[PDB]
Amino acid sequence: FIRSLF
Amino acid sequence: FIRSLF
Amino acid sequence: MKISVSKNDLENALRYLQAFLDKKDASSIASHIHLEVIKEKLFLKASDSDIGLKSYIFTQSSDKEGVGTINGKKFLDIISCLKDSNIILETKDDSLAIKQNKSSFKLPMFDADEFPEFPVIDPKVSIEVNAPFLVDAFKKIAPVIEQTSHKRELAGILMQFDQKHQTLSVVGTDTKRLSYTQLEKISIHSTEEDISCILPKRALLEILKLFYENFSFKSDGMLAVIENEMHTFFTKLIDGNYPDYQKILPKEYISSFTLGKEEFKESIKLCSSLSSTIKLTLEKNNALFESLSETAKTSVEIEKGLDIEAFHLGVNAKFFLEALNALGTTQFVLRCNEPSSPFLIQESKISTLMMPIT
Amino acid sequence: MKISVSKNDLENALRYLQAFLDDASSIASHIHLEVIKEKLFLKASDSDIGLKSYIFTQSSDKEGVGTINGKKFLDIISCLKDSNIILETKDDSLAIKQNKSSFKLPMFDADEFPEFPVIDPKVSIEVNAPFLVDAFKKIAPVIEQTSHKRELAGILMQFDQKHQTLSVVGTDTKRLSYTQLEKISIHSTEEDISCILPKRALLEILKLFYENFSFKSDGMLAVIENEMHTFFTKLIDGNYPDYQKILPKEYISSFTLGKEEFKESIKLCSSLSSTIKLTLEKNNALFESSETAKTSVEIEKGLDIEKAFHLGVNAKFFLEALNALGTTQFVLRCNEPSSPFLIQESKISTLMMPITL
Amino acid sequence: MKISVSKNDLENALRYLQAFLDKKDASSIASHIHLEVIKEKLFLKASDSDIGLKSYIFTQSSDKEGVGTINGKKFLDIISCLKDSNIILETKDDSLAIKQNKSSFKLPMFDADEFPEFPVIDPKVSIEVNAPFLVDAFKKIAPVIEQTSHKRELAGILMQFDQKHQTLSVVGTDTKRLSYTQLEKISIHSTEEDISCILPKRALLEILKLFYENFSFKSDGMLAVIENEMHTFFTKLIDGNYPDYQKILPKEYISSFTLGKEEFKESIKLCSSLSSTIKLTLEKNNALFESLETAKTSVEIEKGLDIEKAFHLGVNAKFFLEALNALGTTQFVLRCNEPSSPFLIQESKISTLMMPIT
Amino acid sequence: MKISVSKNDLENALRYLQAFLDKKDASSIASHIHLEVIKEKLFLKASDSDIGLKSYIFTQSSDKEGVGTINGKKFLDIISCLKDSNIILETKDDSLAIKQNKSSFKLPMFDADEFPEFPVIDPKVSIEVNAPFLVDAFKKIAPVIEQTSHKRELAGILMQFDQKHQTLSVVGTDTKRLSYTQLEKISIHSTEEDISCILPKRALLEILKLFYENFSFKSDGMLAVIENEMHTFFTKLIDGNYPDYQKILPKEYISSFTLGKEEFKESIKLCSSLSSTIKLTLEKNNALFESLDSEHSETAKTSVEIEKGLDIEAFHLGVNAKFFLEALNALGTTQFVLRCNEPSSPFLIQESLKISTLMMPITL
């Protein structure tokens, strides 16, 4: 489960 | 098409 | 259990075993490779129900004997990542520990007593194979057999033992071509005189990877077990009656043409770039090939003129090539009656009967 | 064609052209043939991208034009011997001949093959160093062809004429990879100008170009040209996000770490899972995937930390970031475990979002 | 001087330079590679009087410009041991420092002002080469030329420029075969006189590694300089007068036979396994090959030759093959007068005149 | 004689046989390969007195059985030129005919009864080898042995059978390094208790190409015969007494250092680009490697970290690079043990938790 950078 | 040997 | 094994030996054993696993379902024991240390050998087994393989490698050290199980796919994954050095294998409770230097892995094991034992059969038929001819025949006949056939029985290769005449006939078909050979001088130790085993295509392709010469073949009509010094292999047979191939082989041919194998191979490859079916026209001093607005054509000269007054013949390119690949001679014989009737291909010893296109 | 003899120079030309083809009813499935003097010129295009190429002829008995199905043409040539092959037009057919083998294929009217675009460059550079294409190679993996954000489905080229800089930028929202090339003579009408090359185009550029080519764009197409090829691609319409506004200005820690040690450790754990827990201690780094993979590497040059620093990472992202580096060691800069972290050498940097737990 | 360069770029540059060194004597400056940083480029030179190469790689960083030398063989040895990462190069006094993470090397340098400068020539002749035809001709003619010839002038390939007719003739011979081609439509920037350059075989073989299309060729009768974007190459020329090849070419041939190249190649390979000379017998509808204990083979010629009696011809196998390798057509022409007289081989660019054996 | 054989099978058999020929002299019978068809097998033999090989391939047809000879080199040359189809082999008078399609070769034969027979020995010692450990040990020890030794007996590998303790010791040396291993649990069927065979290096290198597992080894003190299903191999043994290796092995070592194999390998390769001898400096948490004086201005240095700190007061050691590498190639573990006493005294290399190498250092 990954965070969104943009 | 090809007819069956049998 | 506690052993050290060489990375390359293990990886190699584990590659061959993958085919024998039910990898799709990791809940199953069938997804696991069964491990067993006896003296200086690690014995590896995998099985689904259809096929099975036992294999072994030698240990670099055997500090403790014992048994174990591990997910077969995951085991290979891990071993392929490690260095070309020794790898420690060791059981701890219900886990398998894999260690190499500072890298350590744990994997869960099933109870190894619930891994199914390999079958012991009472042979109805049994032969010892020292020549490569059987496995050469498998190799050459395998392409004509399709794994997913309308007729279940055709989905393998036939082994027809005739104890009386010491013959093992090997036969493959997909209804459009029939490829066959008969091996002479086989000491067939069997209960009945005649006995047929149909090996599934999947099993056949595994046999090709594992065996060549110096192995035993036993069957009991249900399973068939192949064994040599490194491996015991088993497969279920296809239940069913293979059709009587001898009844469909034409007894007589009007013509028989001696023709150059590589010339024909090359010509058929050429026309095959544009279409899978080819028109082949045999003339007295010439053979012409044409793809069947686009066109490929090519021709080869036949110096030794054929016994003709021209003969047209529609053929599947890939079938004709696979038939010629089965031959070891430099020239081949094509026997035919009418253009619409089956024709035979053989050496100038695997023969292929083929239905033309019409 | 009109009647040419030519080598398996041909096969090679035809392999490269396959990617530029489209449906055999379409003209776009055909390669356009043209003989001028001692050259056979080959073109393929499907609207988005296009390639012009040529080979020399072994003989040119007649000049002329033609078309042929591009896939079928390659199939036929790849079957022939390593000798000369005769090419010849006969009415609306292309004849391919070699010794006793002769092939016929139908041609479209070659006037209805679409022309390659002539653009008025808004921007234009000459590339002699390999750095641009090295940057494409390294940044390409982080870009995905099928992105929710249309503009992210390519690589950004950001020209700043004033400072002579070409910035190259890729992202998929989970990692941002970037580099800035100095000393580029940028011949451009505006000062600032951005081209987004599609991923598909980017992968073709990698096969065809390295050094010694021109790059021109007009904001709609971009044309790359060297002595052998003219290549064109449409650009992605849209505004690429301002990458510099997301780059953290300050990092609490910065750790100098061994590249191949980390690569090998990440490959190891990646055999059991795609995400890895990475624990940095003062003199040690440990990597962990009922199942477990673990492994550790020593760090002789002790890190500046009191408590150990845990960090969830995607294995393949971390590897691809380290493949972009040319140094033997790398720098990892991070603030909190949940915040983005940077990877760079002792030209390409990668900002990466971690995973939690 | 202080730079960082990529290991692969450097290693590659250094491999190509080895051939240009006098490695035999490490006391000599000629055993060294000259290093020079200008802006973002490291320029590398090696030379041993006869031949020379200048090359460059791009720098990953250029902290200081400067010059240096280093033993060329030892430099490659070191670089080939390092990792695929950047390598620091740096001068310290009269030493070159090579550094990559914890590994550091020192090597002694010569005064780089005493490294000889590459020649600047005033071109007597000059051409720009965009087609591959010249270098294709070098490749095909090179085998016929021997480095160690009794005749000094034959120890290279001839380039004969005729400005008047825009022709560059390329010619090779040992005294047993003469291979030649003439390139049309060359813009020869020279004086109106003819002008001949003989490139040594050693130089010729280096040209083949470095060049194909898109280069300049200049000569002044003493040196010849070849240049493209990556390299400047120089070689001394061979000083003699190459013999007038056109005077020994027969003007007329009694017979001319159109024959199949790959058939002849394969047949000659076959007989060559037992002897280097072959008896070749041409009949109307076939050609026979026999070693001169015994190899024989034959090929059919469908398109019958114009001959009443059969034509025998002794040939060197390897010469005949090398002549056929020069051809790009699928068939070839063999023209001969008597069995003992020279015979010609050519396509249906490169022709080979060959002396037979009796 | 009249057979057909597959081109690949034959070519392959003939490649292996080349090493057993006396190709130097084509007048000799020893330059020939002896051919023999029995049933569905073509048997091939080559020998030059010191070594010999028997091999076979299966026939695609056997129309007539018989014997023959042919020049072994020329036979391979011809077969390698032919196509991947069947090849006809046939005797006609005193010639061997090789045919394939339109290509036909003739070669002269010697009388095949004058081809020397392979030896039948009465085994003084005999073992059956199923594990790969013997041949693994040959492979790893072979580099240390030199074919052209001043001492005749060192020009091979030693096989020391001790029937009493079921041990086969395998030993190689060139006087500067001694490499050895002892295999346990060998059923040694022998007449005497102790018995030594010294195999020549040439023979040893051929054994490596032909054998791995599942073969017999018999010797009578003069020859040694190795046999499996495909091959019978023979070699003469080196007449002589191999020195007592056990008397030179140090019984005790002051220090023993557990060290990383691939780290050391890389570091030694690096410094070996400038000089063949290396100064190795062991510190508690670090090992350093430096090329030794080479041309005064040159230097290679590099270092590796040792996480598991060593137990020491720094230890310098001069070593031959290539010897140290060859010793580490013998090991299958990831880490190795270096045991030493003084800098000038021999040191030992072996695995961490088969093959050990004792090595003489260099000074300074």
Numbering used by the authors:
A (entry chain L), B (entry chain G): 370 to 375
C (entry chain A): 1 to 292, 297 to 313, 315 to 353, 364 to 373
D (entry chain D): 1 to 22, 25 to 291, 297 to 353, 364 to 374
E (entry chain C): 1 to 292, 298 to 353, 364 to 373
F (entry chain B): 1 to 313, 315 to 354, 364 to 374
What do the study authors state?
The sliding clamp is a ring-shaped protein complex that encircles DNA with the help of clamp loader in an ATP-dependent manner, and slides along the DNA. In prokaryotes, however, β-clamp is a homodimer, with each monomer consisting of three globular domains, and in this way β-clamp displays a six-domain ring. Although β-clamp is part of the DNA polymerase III holoenzyme, it is not attached to polymerase III permanently like the other subunits. β-clamp is loaded on the DNA, by clamp loader, a subunit of DNA Pol III. In both prokaryotes and eukaryotes, a key feature of this clamp-binding motif is the presence of hydrophobic amino acid residues that bind to the hydrophobic pocket in the C-terminal region of the clamp.
To validate the region in HpDNA ligase predicted by us to be an Hpβ-clamp binding region, we co-crystallized Hpβ-clamp with the peptide 554QEFIRSLF561 from DNA ligase. The co-crystal structure belongs to space group P212121 with four monomers making two dimers (first above the second) per asymmetric unit. Out of two dimers, the peptide was found to occupy both the binding sites of the first dimer, while second clamp dimer did not show any peptide bound to them. The binding of the peptide to the binding pocket of beta clamp is dominated by hydrophobic interactions. Out of eight residues of peptide 554QEFIRSLF561, the density for Gln554 and Glu555 was missing in both the chains. Ile557, Leu560 and Phe561 interact with the residues that are present in the cleft between domain II and III in both the chains suggesting their importance for β-clamp interaction. One noticeable thing is that residue Thr175 of β-clamp in both the chains makes hydrogen bond with backbone nitrogen of Leu560 from the peptide, suggesting that this must be a conserved residue in the protein-binding pocket. A comparison of the native β-clamp structure with the peptide-bound β-clamp structure showed differences in the positions of some of the residues at the protein-binding pocket of β-clamp. The residues involved in peptide binding reveal the maximal local displacement, the positions of residues Lys176 and M370 of β-clamp were found to differ between these two structures compared to native structure. The binding of ligase peptide at both interacting sites indicates that both sites of Hpβ-clamp could be used simultaneously as a processivity promoting factor.
